[PDB]
Design an enzyme around this catalytic site. Structure first.
Site, PDB file in Angstrom:
ATOM      1  N   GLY A 150       0.708  -1.038   0.077  1.00 16.50           N
ATOM      2  CA  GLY A 150       0.014   0.013   0.058  1.00 16.50           C
ATOM      3  C   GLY A 150       0.848   1.196   0.073  1.00 16.50           C
ATOM      4  CG  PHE A 195       7.097  11.951   1.808  1.00 22.43           C
ATOM      5  CD1 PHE A 195       7.198  13.089   1.058  1.00 22.43           C
ATOM      6  CD2 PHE A 195       6.937  11.927   3.249  1.00 22.43           C
ATOM      7  CE1 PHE A 195       6.945  14.097   1.781  1.00 22.43           C
ATOM      8  CE2 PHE A 195       6.406  13.271   3.806  1.00 22.43           C
ATOM      9  CZ  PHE A 195       6.761  14.239   3.119  1.00 22.43           C
ATOM     10  CE  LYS A 204       6.514   5.827   2.915  1.00 23.07           C
ATOM     11  NZ  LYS A 204       5.805   6.356   3.973  1.00 23.07           N
ATOM     12  CG  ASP A 237      -0.370   9.733   7.810  1.00 23.42           C
ATOM     13  OD1 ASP A 237      -1.394   9.686   8.368  1.00 23.42           O
ATOM     14  OD2 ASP A 237       0.292   9.209   6.802  1.00 23.42           O
ATOM     15  NE  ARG A 278      -2.736   5.508   6.149  1.00 22.95           N
ATOM     16  CZ  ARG A 278      -2.388   6.585   6.400  1.00 22.95           C
ATOM     17  NH1 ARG A 278      -3.099   7.371   7.303  1.00 22.95           N
ATOM     18  NH2 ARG A 278      -1.106   7.166   6.169  1.00 22.95           N
ATOM     19  CG  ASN A 279       0.487   4.702   9.296  1.00 25.55           C
ATOM     20  OD1 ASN A 279       0.684   3.924   8.443  1.00 25.55           O
ATOM     21  ND2 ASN A 279       0.615   6.189   8.956  1.00 25.55           N
TER      22      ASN A 279
HETATM   23  C1  LIG Z   1      -3.100  -2.601   6.866  1.00 27.60           C
HETATM   24  C2  LIG Z   1      -2.607  -1.230   6.425  1.00 27.60           C
HETATM   25  C3  LIG Z   1      -2.023  -1.451   5.356  1.00 27.60           C
HETATM   26  O1  LIG Z   1      -2.433  -2.425   4.591  1.00 27.60           O
HETATM   27  N1  LIG Z   1      -0.915  -0.680   5.075  1.00 27.60           N
HETATM   28  C4  LIG Z   1      -0.624   0.435   5.971  1.00 27.60           C
HETATM   29  C5  LIG Z   1      -0.412   1.736   4.783  1.00 27.60           C
HETATM   30  C6  LIG Z   1      -0.269   0.915   3.662  1.00 27.60           C
HETATM   31  C7  LIG Z   1      -0.419  -0.463   3.783  1.00 27.60           C
HETATM   32  C8  LIG Z   1       1.314  -0.864   4.279  1.00 27.60           C
HETATM   33  C9  LIG Z   1       1.461  -1.156   5.841  1.00 27.60           C
HETATM   34  N2  LIG Z   1       2.720  -1.177   6.402  1.00 27.60           N
HETATM   35  N3  LIG Z   1       3.682  -0.343   5.980  1.00 27.60           N
HETATM   36  C10 LIG Z   1       4.524  -0.464   6.815  1.00 27.60           C
HETATM   37  C11 LIG Z   1       5.859   0.323   6.739  1.00 27.60           C
HETATM   38  C12 LIG Z   1       5.372   1.706   6.921  1.00 27.60           C
HETATM   39  C13 LIG Z   1       6.442   2.659   6.834  1.00 27.60           C
HETATM   40  C14 LIG Z   1       7.672   2.188   6.389  1.00 27.60           C
HETATM   41  O2  LIG Z   1       8.854   3.289   6.215  1.00 27.60           O
HETATM   42  C15 LIG Z   1       9.205   3.787   7.311  1.00 27.60           C
HETATM   43  C16 LIG Z   1      10.221   4.913   7.428  1.00 27.60           C
HETATM   44  C17 LIG Z   1      10.698   5.402   8.424  1.00 27.60           C
HETATM   45  C18 LIG Z   1      10.676   4.713   9.863  1.00 27.60           C
HETATM   46  C19 LIG Z   1      10.021   3.786   9.811  1.00 27.60           C
HETATM   47  C20 LIG Z   1       9.172   2.951   8.781  1.00 27.60           C
HETATM   48  N4  LIG Z   1       9.840   3.081  11.095  1.00 27.60           N
HETATM   49  C21 LIG Z   1      10.689   3.964  11.704  1.00 27.60           C
HETATM   50  N5  LIG Z   1      11.288   5.008  10.768  1.00 27.60           N
HETATM   51  C22 LIG Z   1      12.190   6.109  11.298  1.00 27.60           C
HETATM   52  C23 LIG Z   1       8.032   1.013   6.173  1.00 27.60           C
HETATM   53  C24 LIG Z   1       9.566   0.458   5.794  1.00 27.60           C
HETATM   54  C25 LIG Z   1       7.064  -0.062   6.370  1.00 27.60           C
HETATM   55  C26 LIG Z   1       4.433  -1.952   7.146  1.00 27.60           C
HETATM   56  C27 LIG Z   1       5.329  -2.723   7.977  1.00 27.60           C
HETATM   57  C28 LIG Z   1       6.816  -2.667   8.405  1.00 27.60           C
HETATM   58  N6  LIG Z   1       4.871  -4.217   8.322  1.00 27.60           N
HETATM   59  C29 LIG Z   1       3.620  -4.284   7.868  1.00 27.60           C
HETATM   60  N7  LIG Z   1       2.681  -3.474   7.065  1.00 27.60           N
HETATM   61  C30 LIG Z   1       3.221  -2.327   6.948  1.00 27.60           C
HETATM   62  C31 LIG Z   1       0.685  -0.023   6.431  1.00 27.60           C
END
Ligand SMILES: *CCC(=O)N1[C@@H]2CC[C@H]1C[C@@H](n1nc(-c3ccc(Oc4ccc5c(c4)ncn5C)c(C)c3)c3c(C)ncnc31)C2
Ligand SMILES: [Cl-]
Length: 308
Positions: free
Chosen positions: A16, A20, A42, A136, A140-141
């Protein structure tokens, strides 16, 4: 934290989007080894601005290596900079809490709901302690590591890029209006107290089993709605005591909203006698935790922290 080579990472499917960049489920095979580690990657969208700098690892590492010391907030395990910026973290195996409550509805228990609220408040309290405004927060987060362990994710990137979200035109002009404090909508002002507003909406999503806030109301009409005093309604399973905390989070006066440290203590208190504060009704079988790893090879690691 590690600098990853692009040959170490493979994307296997898209999960998803968020501000950014897009998140993929992927596999990390550490360089020189054969073990397979599920990760989330990401990928930042490219900056479309013609006047933007056309131009590193050290700069990104310095900004994303922050907030690494709480069980309730995610941390990166690596970055990979090539033509694109890839940010890599452990894949949380049970997805997001938003999907979990939507799928389980009335099978949930009051104790679980209040425990998740208290853990989210603990994570936000930690982010406030390390001076990192999230910008944010939403259900979902909030990711599920295990039934009794959730983690807040996706933060730190607006200050890395030094870019207001609305000016990053690769995001198509989408912003989470229905979770944002009024001062963030109108003046793009983000503080830990605007995070408190988003926390209240997140609690509302959980207590409604994942309803969409202000469903049917167009985003362009939300500032006028809030300025007239209208708020999200009381979730049927919430006592007035819990709804009062949500209303305090949505006051226009940001200094009158609760502090995260006080939200931690309030929800810990309620979680110790949950049926006095949340009553799941007959109108609303065990809960099912849906796994993001159900199609992975059994020999792949389950958690990157197992890796040596
Ligand atoms: C259920 C909701 C859903 O399906 N989703 C939400 C929004 C889109 C999808 C993907 C899902 N999801 N995101 C991440 C995730 C989020 C951000 C991210 O980037 C960072 C950047 C900086 C950072 C981070 C994370 N942590 C700390 N810092 C400084 C990444 C790399 C990944 C998910 C993860 C890790 N696992 C499962 N689902 C995720 C959220
Ligand atoms: Cl007010």
């Amino acid at each position: 934290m590690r600098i990853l080579k692009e040959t170490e990472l493979r994307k296997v499917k898209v999960l998803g989007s968020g501000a950014f960049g897009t998140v993929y489920k992927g596999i990390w095979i550490p360089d020189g080894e054969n073990v397979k580690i599920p990760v989330a990657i990401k990928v930042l969208r490219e900056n479309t601005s013609p006047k933007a700098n056309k131009e590193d690892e050290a700069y990104v590492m310095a900004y994303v290596m922050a907030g690494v010391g709480s069980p309730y907030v995610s941390r990166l395990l690596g970055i990979c900079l090539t033509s694109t910026v890839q940010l890599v973290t452990q894949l949380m195996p049970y997805g997001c809490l938003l999907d979990h409550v939507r799928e389980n509805r009335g099978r949930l228990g009051s104790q679980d709901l209040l425990n998740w609220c208290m853990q989210i408040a603990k994570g936000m309290s930690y982010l406030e302690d390390v001076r990192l405004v999230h910008r944010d927060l939403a259900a979902r987060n909030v990711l599920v590591k295990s039934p009794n362990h959730v983690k807040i994710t996706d933060f730190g990137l607006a200050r890395l890029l030094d870019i207001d979200e609305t000016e990053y035109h690769a995001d198509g002009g989408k912003v989470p209006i229905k979770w944002m404090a009024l001062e963030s909508i109108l003046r793009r002002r983000f503080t830990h107290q605007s995070d408190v507003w988003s926390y209240g909406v997140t609690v509302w999503e959980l207590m409604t089993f994942g309803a969409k806030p202000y469903d049917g109301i167009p985003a362009r009409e939300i500032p006028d709605l809030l300025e007239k005093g209208e708020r999200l309604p009381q979730p049927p399973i919430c006592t007035i005591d819990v709804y009062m905390i949500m209303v305090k989070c949505w006051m226009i006066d940001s200094e009158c909203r609760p502090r995260f440290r006080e939200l931690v203590s309030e929800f810990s208190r309620m979680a110790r006698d949950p049926q006095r504060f949340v009553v799941i009704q007959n109108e609303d079988d065990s809960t099912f935790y849906r796994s993001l790893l159900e199609d992975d090879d059994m020999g792949d690691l389950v958690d990157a922290e197992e890796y040596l």
